[PDB]
Design a binder for this molecule. Sequence first.
Ligand SMILES: COC(=O)c1ccc(O)cc1
Ligand SMILES: [Cl-]
Ligand SMILES: [Cl-]
Ligand SMILES: [Cl-]
Length: 163
Amino acid sequence: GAMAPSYRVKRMDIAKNDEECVVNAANPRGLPGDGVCKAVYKKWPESFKNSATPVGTAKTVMCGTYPVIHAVGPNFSNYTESEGDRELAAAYREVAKEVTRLGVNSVAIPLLSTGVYSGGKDRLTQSLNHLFTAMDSTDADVVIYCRDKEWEKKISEAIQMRT
Ligand SMILES: COC(=O)c1ccc(O)cc1
Ligand SMILES: [Cl-]
Ligand SMILES: [Cl-]
Ligand SMILES: [Cl-]
């Protein structure tokens, strides 16, 4: 574990992370995708061998010895608010299981279902609170990656609020 497990937030490409493993905002079919998923495909393409997994699950594939945890959040275009909320919570619970299983001291994680799977809504708070619910019982250092300047400030505030 980390000596003093922490949450941090950085505004940059998750493909440049300084953590011991990465969470991909994957599609269910293991396709290259767009946004975070495309960046992960360019950096760790070997990790897309047999990475297809259902919505609400996570599947880890090694790139060398570097673990890529493919986490499939729901696309809110297809799910009801109720069913999507349940699947988004479930995906993060499966990320916490994998992070624990791998024995890593640190993990880089994006906010699932906040980009092209958001169904055109702002889901920062919804997605971050499900991240915290899953990861709070883990002892890895968690580093959340985002690209928007206003989101960085809001994620940083939410972390500092609970310290
Ligand atoms: C946290 O978001 C990213 O890491 C990211 C990377 C590449 C993109 O094109 C978009 C977002
Ligand atoms: Cl960058
Ligand atoms: Cl997304
Ligand atoms: Cl963002």
